[PDB]
A = this chain, B = another copy of it.
């Protein structure tokens, strides 16, 4: 299975586009969090299916599969957010019928901070001209490299290695310099830290919200949160 064929299977693993079915209208504090949690919940379902389509994922023990997703679900959502917003400076395209500015994130306390982290990192990927195929590998790497740590474990590293090798290949095909190729790989990988940082901040904020019973936490998003 060459790097090219592995990337193709990730493309085929891409989840479907989601909409929250909200008639276009101004966002208030209740409707905004309501929309974000309702969408995160729908996407979580598709994330599980997406993960099982990554060659070898289903061959991991159930403990690993569960632990890897409980660990990275928020990062994969944000990484998907950044890809979709890449072509729209200033905006965060959570969904076609759920688009937010920085000013809209002001109505809700603690959110403007998170949006800024997401906008800055989206902006960063935008100046590097993140390519779709790169997006695919990176998003996969987030899943496989999320949680901190024999038969199953070796398969993970083997699987993570495979995706790493797929990202190198994609960069190799851009035809750029070898120095430029190495510089691009590092610039893309260094952003994983930023995605993880916003993730920790978003769950912290989401968790506080749950405790206040201000958001309609849905079954799936709920256990992914508690985990």
Contacts and interface: CB of A to CB of B under 8 A. Distances in A.
Interface of A: 116-117, 120-121, 141, 145-149, 160-161, 164-165, 167-168, 178-179, 181-183, 185-187, 189-190, 192-197, 200
Contact of A185 (B120, B146, B182): B182
A186 to B, nearest CB: 5
Contacts of A145: 190, 193-194
Contacts of A161: 183, 187
Interface of A is mostly: helix
Contacts of A185: 182, 185-186, 189
A164 B178 contact: no
Most central of A120, A179, A181, A194 by chain B CB within 10 Å: A194
Most central of A145, A148, A161 by chain B CB within 10 Å: A148
B186 A167 contact: yes
A165 B183 CA distance: 7
Given A164-B183, A197-B200, 14 more contacts: A120-B148, A141-B190, A147-B194, A148-B197, A164-B182, A164-B186, A168-B182, A168-B186, A181-B182, A182-B182, A189-B189, A190-B192, A196-B196, A196-B197
